[PDB]
Amino acid sequence: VASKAIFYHAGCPVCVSAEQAVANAIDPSKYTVEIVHLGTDKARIAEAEKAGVKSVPALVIDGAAFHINFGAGIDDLKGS
Amino acid sequence: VASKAIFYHAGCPVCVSAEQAVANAIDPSKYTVEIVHLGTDKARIAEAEKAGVKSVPALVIDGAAFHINFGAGIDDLKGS
């Protein structure tokens, strides 16, 4: 087993930077990196709200969503 | 490699959270995390600027600065 690290992002440039660097620097041995793309699935947005994802990209560790490099917020994805 | 990750903080509560989770997810066996406290050395603001550190609780990996959940603005600790 390992710790849980859920990485939410919408595929934004800033998100790619965090994914490529930080999310790849994290080893699946200690932390299971679960990347969730919000740039297509609008149903998972409701999940992000409750996960603690208020911006992207967000690294949810133990429930705490660390928003690494503010590219877009969840409000920016929340049109109507 | 064993390049260092430069973590700038200011003693704020957010520093602790980032240090506990993120700074252990990126262990020194991969990247040596260097804890830089601007609360101790104030003349290091000029260094942070050139490093790319626009805000505290943030880490610089191989040169790329990533702000963890946006800790505190560097200009919040600075006047003019």
Side-chain angles (χ1 to χ4, degrees), chain A residues 14 17-19 21-22 24-27 30-31 59 61-62 65-70, chain B residues 14 17-18 20-22 24-27 30-31 59 61 64-70:
Chain A
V14 186
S17 307
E19 182 187 88
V22 184
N24 279 214
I26 303 177
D27 56 283
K30 284 185 291 302
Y31 288 79
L59 181 62
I61 300 178
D62 268 283
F66 299 103
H67 303 94
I68 303 176
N69 280 28
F70 181 75
Chain B
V14 183
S17 314
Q20 297 179 151
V22 185
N24 276 274
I26 307 177
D27 61 276
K30 303 173 300 184
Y31 300 103
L59 77 172
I61 304 176
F66 296 102
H67 296 99
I68 306 176
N69 196 83
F70 183 75

Side-chain angles (χ1 to χ4, degrees), chain B residues 3-71:
Chain B
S3 36
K4 68 171 183 179
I6 318 174
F7 179 74
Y8 285 80
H9 71 109
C12 312
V14 183
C15 314
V16 188
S17 314
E19 190 189 283
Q20 297 179 151
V22 185
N24 276 274
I26 307 177
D27 61 276
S29 187
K30 303 173 300 184
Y31 300 103
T32 313
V33 184
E34 182 168 78
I35 303 300
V36 182
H37 184 32
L38 296 182
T40 308
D41 190 69
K42 190 177 186 176
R44 200 147 305 225
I45 295 178
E47 175 180 85
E49 300 182 296
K50 301 179 181 62
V53 183
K54 298 172 177 175
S55 304
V56 287
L59 77 172
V60 183
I61 304 176
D62 262 71
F66 296 102
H67 296 99
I68 306 176
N69 196 83
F70 183 75

Side-chain angles (χ1 to χ4, degrees), chain A residues 15-56:
Chain A
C15 305
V16 179
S17 307
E19 182 187 88
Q20 176 179 148
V22 184
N24 279 214
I26 303 177
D27 56 283
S29 309
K30 284 185 291 302
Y31 288 79
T32 309
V33 185
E34 298 170 89
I35 301 178
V36 181
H37 195 262
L38 299 174
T40 304
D41 193 310
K42 297 175 181 172
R44 302 186 196 213
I45 299 179
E47 177 182 89
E49 308 175 305
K50 301 157 186 53
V53 182
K54 298 168 182 170
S55 303
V56 293

